[PDB]
């Protein structure tokens, strides 16, 4: 039927409310459940590349696929135990990896769609239209927005550039590629990497795949760099109703450093990723993972040395935990690039009530 149990490592003391634990290795589940979703969830769980942009798209694609495959029962209508099935799927997803703002939005959209075409329609007529509608939506709200953002970025550079960069976000990478290629400017890219999930390395690889003049650094190695260098960029995941930056890891420190050294930062935003939920701290709701994210020593990821550290539960009287999603300072990043080109973060919910 399904049971949790067995949690790895020490539970510490602080930050004890969020679902993060359990079903890593597969051992007996429910009967007539479609396994593609499960597979996707598993992939998401053991992923080291994904960041903000693609996950939601992938989910959408999966849903589309499901719809295409969907069989209408020989006796009952299209939705009766379907809702139950969906609920189960949602639960499974939750168990695997937390449902973000994008995921919530997707769920809302699904619900809207359900409301639109409610128990009356046969097999290959309703879903034929629905799928196409979904495709159209995908074409509209996302890709075109990205294109717009790219074009905005294109103009945003005038005379000479020397840049320090961070982020897994695809849009930033795309921008960088554009700068390298179809603009032929005097671009310089300095890369900052983060430990929990590797983004900097990916960025570097992408740069290489183009052939760019590239400097490389990390979270702490910052001070000696600025001894000419101007522009700084960041990539955010989601912004709340509050106006505060509820994004991924090492951004805020970098931003602060930039502020100190007298040339500010610009982050890129999306015209969908906004939530009804209200938070201003780390404790409320956070991306939290198993302490295995900080085990590997030197150069690369897969090396494994039996030298100094290699235990968690055996490490008696020790409280080992780490944060993934951070709540960055509101006044620090100056420019934000959405569908309406340019504007301050004083917008906050100027698209939320717009619906």
């Amino acid at each position: 039927p399904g049971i949790s149990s067995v949690i790895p490592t020490v539970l510490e003391q602080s930050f004890d409310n969020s679902s993060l634990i359990s079903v890593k290795e597969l051992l007996l589940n429910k009967d007539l459940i479609h396994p593609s979703i499960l597979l996707l969830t598993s992939h998401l769980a053991h992923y080291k590349i994904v960041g903000s942009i693609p996950r939601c798209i992938a989910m959408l694609e999966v849903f589309q696929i499901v719809i295409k495959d969907y069989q209408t029962p020989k006796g009952t209508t299209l939705s009766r135990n379907l809702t139950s099935y969906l609920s189960h799927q949602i639960d499974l997803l939750k168990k695997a990896r937390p449902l973000s703002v994008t995921m919530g939005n997707a769920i809302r959209w699904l619900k809207q769609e359900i409301s639109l075409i409610d128990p009356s329609t046969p097999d290959k007529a309703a879903k034929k239209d629905l799928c196409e509608k979904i495709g159209q939506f995908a074409k509209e709200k996302i890709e075109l927005a990205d294109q717009l953002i790219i074009d905005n970025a294109s103009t945003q550079i005038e005379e000479s550039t020397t840049i320090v960069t961070y982020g897994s976000s695809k849009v930033l990478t795309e921008l960088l590629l554009h700068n390298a290629i179809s603009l032929k400017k005097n671009i310089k890219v300095i890369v900052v990497d983060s430990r929990p999930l590797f983004e900097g390395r990916k960025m570097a690889e992408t740069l290489r795949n183009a052939g760019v003049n590239v400097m490389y650094a990390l979270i702490t190695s910052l001070d000696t760099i600025f001894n000419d260098v101007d522009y700084v960029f960041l990539g955010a995941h989601s912004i709340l109703s509050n106006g505060f930056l509820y994004s991924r890891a090492g951004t805020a420190m970098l931003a602060m450093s930039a502020k100190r050294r007298n040339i500010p930062v610009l982050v890129c935003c999306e015209s969908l990723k906004f939530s009804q939920r209200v938070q201003l701290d780390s404790v409320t709701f956070n991306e939290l993972a198993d302490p295995n994210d900080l085990v590997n020593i030197d150069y690369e990821n897969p090396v494994e040395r039996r030298g100094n550290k290699g235990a968690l539960l055996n490490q008696f009287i020790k409280e080992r935990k780490f944060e993934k999603k951070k709540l960055a300072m509101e006044n620090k990043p100056k420019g934000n690039k959405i569908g309406g080109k340019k504007g301050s973060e004083g917008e906050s919910k100027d698209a939320s009530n717009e619906e």
Binding site: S14, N17, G243, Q276, L280, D281, G346, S348, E354
Partner: protein, 345 residues
């Protein structure tokens, strides 16, 4: 229009006036209720049919009331809200009676470019709705506050008295598993008794209470996590005038040491009027409960103020019945219920 008909039309107007001027009345919600009742009385006996004139009269009355007391706002605000409610309906009605109207959404430039029904019953129903809303903000704000508080965090609670704030606190305490510490500043003049009452109420349910001297904030602010205020008056740029006693210095201290500030608020308690000068809006208070006997008062000069204004440089969240809003954004919220026209008359 003057206060000439406002005696023979309704039963209790003089008493209301007295309450306004001489401060016989207590509680902002109670004041609001009274105002609603007055409005009902105005409506119930009189038959007008001509609506715009009536609206204008009401506006004038409101203005007069505002002029009567420079730092009382709630009564005025309620009236303004009611006017706003009426106005849109009236506009709709006119458009039906006459018979392009809307191109996209709520857009500007309308200030430069040229723009029998069962109405009474509808108006009555609106008033009833308003009354209901005023009654049940307790079930309105209830589940927005339980989204920003957690464990091992010290909470400063200055100036508590109102039944809204108290109810919020009770709700917070109900889930007692969350670790919250209650620090209450006494508030030099009038707030002391109220603070004591609050403490007593807390003790009734069993909630830990710590008494704070007003002088000692600098020696505590570095330890305190989150601050909650139960303010009465909310303003344009993000500032507030709260229910008396030492807030400004505390806020300054918080700003210096960087401390998050919450507020239990209502949009009906929010004012569309902007405070522009410190020289006017800050209200000075009585020296009756400072020093006994008046012979030292000849040469010495006692400076004292009861109710204080807060600059928007400090507070960051306004938890309401709708939700938490940004101070440098609350103007939009206000305008989603009020107008630019009903300010200077």
């Amino acid at each position: 229009h003057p206060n000439a008909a406002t005696s023979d039309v309704n039963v209790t107007i003089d008493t209301f006036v007295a309450k306004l001027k001489r401060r016989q009345v207590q509680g902002s919600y109670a004041i609001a209720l009274e105002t609603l009742q007055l409005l009902m009385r105005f409506i119930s006996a009189a038959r007008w049919n001509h609506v715009n004139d009536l609206i204008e009269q009401i506006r004038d009355l409101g203005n007069s009331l505002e002029k009567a007391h420079p730092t009382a706002f709630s009564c005025g605000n309620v009236i303004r809200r009611i006017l706003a409610v009426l106005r849109d309906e009236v506009e709709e009605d006119t458009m039906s009676t006459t018979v392009v109207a809307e191109p996209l959404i709520s857009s500007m430039f309308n200030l430069l470019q040229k723009p029998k029904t069962d109405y009474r019953q509808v108006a009555i129903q609106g008033i009833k709705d308003l009354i209901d809303e005023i009654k049940n903000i307790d079930e309105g704000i209830q589940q927005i506050a339980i989204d920003l508080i957690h464990d091992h965090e010290i909470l400063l609670t200055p100036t508590p008295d109102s039944k809204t704030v108290l109810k919020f606190l009770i709700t917070a305490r109900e889930r007692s598993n969350r670790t919250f510490t209650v620090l209450v500043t006494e508030g030099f003049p009038n707030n002391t008794k109220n603070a004591h009452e609050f403490a007593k109420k807390l003790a009734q349910h069993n909630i830990e209470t710590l008494v704070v001297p007003d002088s000692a904030v600098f020696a505590l602010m570095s330890r305190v996590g989150k601050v909650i205020i139960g303010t009465k008056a909310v303003f344009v740029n993000g500032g507030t005038i709260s229910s008396n006693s030492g807030v400004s210095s505390v806020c300054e201290c918080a700003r210096e040491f960087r401390t998050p500030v919450f507020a239990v608020a209502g949009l009906y308690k929010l004012s569309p009027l902007y405070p522009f000068d410190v020289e006017k809006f800050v209200e000075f208070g009585g020296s009756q409960r400072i020093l006994p006997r008046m012979d030292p008062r000849k040469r010495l000069d006692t400076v004292n103020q009861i109710t204080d204004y807060v600059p928007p440089e400090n507070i960051d969240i306004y938890i309401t019945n709708v939700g938490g809003f940004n101070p440098s954004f609350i103007y939009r919220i206000a305008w989603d219920n009020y107008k630019q026209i009903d300010v200077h008359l």
